[PDB]
Ligand binder design. Sequence first.
Ligand SMILES: CC(C)=CCC/C(C)=C/CC/C(C)=C/CC[C@H](C)CCOP(=O)(O)OP(=O)(O)O
Ligand SMILES: CC(C)=CCC/C(C)=C\CC/C(C)=C/CC[C@H](C)CCOP(=O)(O)OP(=O)(O)O
Lengths: 347, 347
Amino acid sequence: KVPTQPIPLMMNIFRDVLPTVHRYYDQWKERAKSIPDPELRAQALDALERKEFHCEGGGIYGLLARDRFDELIQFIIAYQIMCDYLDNLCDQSDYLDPKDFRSLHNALLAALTPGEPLVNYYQYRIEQEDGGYLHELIETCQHILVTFPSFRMVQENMLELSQLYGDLQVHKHVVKEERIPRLEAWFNEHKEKMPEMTWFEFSACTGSTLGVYTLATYATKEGLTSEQADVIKAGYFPWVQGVHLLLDYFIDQEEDIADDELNFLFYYENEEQMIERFQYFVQKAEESLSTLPDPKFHRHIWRGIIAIYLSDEKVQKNKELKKKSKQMIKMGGLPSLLFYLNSWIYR
Amino acid sequence: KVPTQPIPLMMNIFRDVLPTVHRYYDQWKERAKSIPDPELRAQALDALERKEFHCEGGGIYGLLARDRFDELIQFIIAYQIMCDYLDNLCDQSDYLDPKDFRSLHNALLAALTPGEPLVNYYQYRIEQEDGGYLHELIETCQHILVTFPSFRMVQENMLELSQLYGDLQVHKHVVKEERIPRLEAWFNEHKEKMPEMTWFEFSACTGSTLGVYTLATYATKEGLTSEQADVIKAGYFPWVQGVHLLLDYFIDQEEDIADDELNFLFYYENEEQMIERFQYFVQKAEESLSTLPDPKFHRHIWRGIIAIYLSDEKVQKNKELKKKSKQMIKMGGLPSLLFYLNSWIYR
Ligand SMILES: CC(C)=CCC/C(C)=C/CC/C(C)=C/CC[C@H](C)CCOP(=O)(O)OP(=O)(O)O
Ligand SMILES: CC(C)=CCC/C(C)=C\CC/C(C)=C/CC[C@H](C)CCOP(=O)(O)OP(=O)(O)O
């Protein structure tokens, strides 16, 4: 059974999770260095250099499936590396062609579809020589997932989350003036199925990968039911994924204002409403997580996400953001502890 | 209103204690570079290089005296730097003269005796030109302690612990053949006023500075009685100071074997007696710590000391030492967590 007490959970993270994450991550770093196209190489290495924490955090789900520990971390790391690589490629495109953004994100859907024939995901952009990097990442996922006893039961739900994540990456990276009309029209198709929320709250709920890793984790269990597959998707989507991205956008506010970049928090009528809605998402997230298997573990992961996000220098060394962050959620001083701990190690 | 819950205690340590300690420690580092005698300078800078942990640890007592936070830490750092400097001078002496060791350790007594004129502490050795380094360490302690409203009530108890510490350093640093006779002779002078223990256990009890820092901490309070000063001293001496040094000697057994250093544990008649007496000291130490003001704070600092000591790779990588350590004290998974955390940070 998974560790649910702080000491053994932290001990297993430092002893087993991080060394195993970095064994697989460091191999992708070496592979990325050999990418022929200098722009694809730069974008790959940048994501690997800057977004290590996504794989390190993602790898913690390994603890729920000890008997498939290495395979599950390998899947999560390959999929998460792809997301951060493709985000860079869309972010740094001089061309802003949505066909390119869509074509690239179809790599994530292929990763979740064993035997899906691999295409030129780069077909709508000038840079196409990656020396097999993206293909290698896709096949890694395909060959691992097919070996999980209940992958077939969760596949449809993983594809649902991955398509929504892809649609977001397409709409939010097009030329500035076309973004919000695309996001509102897209939200409009799903708004009936969703709890009552705005286009920009919906946009945040689709932007996380946590549901995919959770569904892949339970795919390792014998005889997982379709009822359980749906419980597990509803555990993280929409509310936990929402809080995750609302936090990402909260921390990044000052640089989004400075670089006139799309920030979903900016479409709230005022900050009072943003704080109220953030607190609602947190309550609905607590309720959705409590429905999962291993509820105490999921509750630990989520509290960890919140504390780690709020421990950012961008929040903790900015008097107004820090004060606003405590209005949003009280974490018994954990964000601040992680900041000063971090500040102390790196000096 | 002293923090005793783990998250805030740790946050204060990383935000307040460690940065304040390193501010003053760094000023002493720069001051030490101005020492004229090359050998005194090398020994002062080597102590400062290798022994920052003693100051970081000692500085945690600040949190019991927030009012005088900066002043108390300046006293603790000045005294501890003096201790580690004198320890280097006595260890690396080519002339092993107990007049020199005694004269040097008389600096600690001067540090605790404001308004009394200073000698040449180097009067019994070749190297004498330190440019006022040792006098400035003494003067720093004197100038802070006089400002403590209850210093006068604790000064006798502090000088008592400083005298025993000085005595130990004198006897343990002489030529190998005359150590145990001095230590046994010295213990026999004190045997009748001490609880039942060996000369080598007594030696362990006198070798810590925790009692001095704790008494200095309660000197910062108005209207401390003689009774309360005797309670505070008895809370650390002898049992807590004994556990602190016995644990140091336990961890360094292979080192002290290989470098042929004096190790008080080796004079137990067998391992089983060693473990049994260690367990007894722990019981008495738990008892004496529970008699203190802010007993939860003292318990936490003491369990932290122990967890940090036992987390040493010297213990965690050695099957036999790990086995014995878990017999000696029940710490749960904390030493192991600290080991894998340290292993991860310093990879
Ligand atoms: C403790 C634990 C389980 C953690 C899991 C964390 C995780 C799996 C995160 C990835 C989930 C994921 C891909 C989140 C989106 C974050 C992404 C960095 C947002 C992109 O915009 P931007 O912020 O501007 O980035 P960039 O342009 O500077 O590169
Ligand atoms: C509250 C908290 C966390 C306290 C921490 C402890 C402290 C403040 C003082 C140690 C108290 C103290 C002076 C202990 C004895 C020090 C001893 C000489 C160091 C160990 O010996 P060794 O390594 O062999 O010398 P060297 O060869 O490296 O130079």
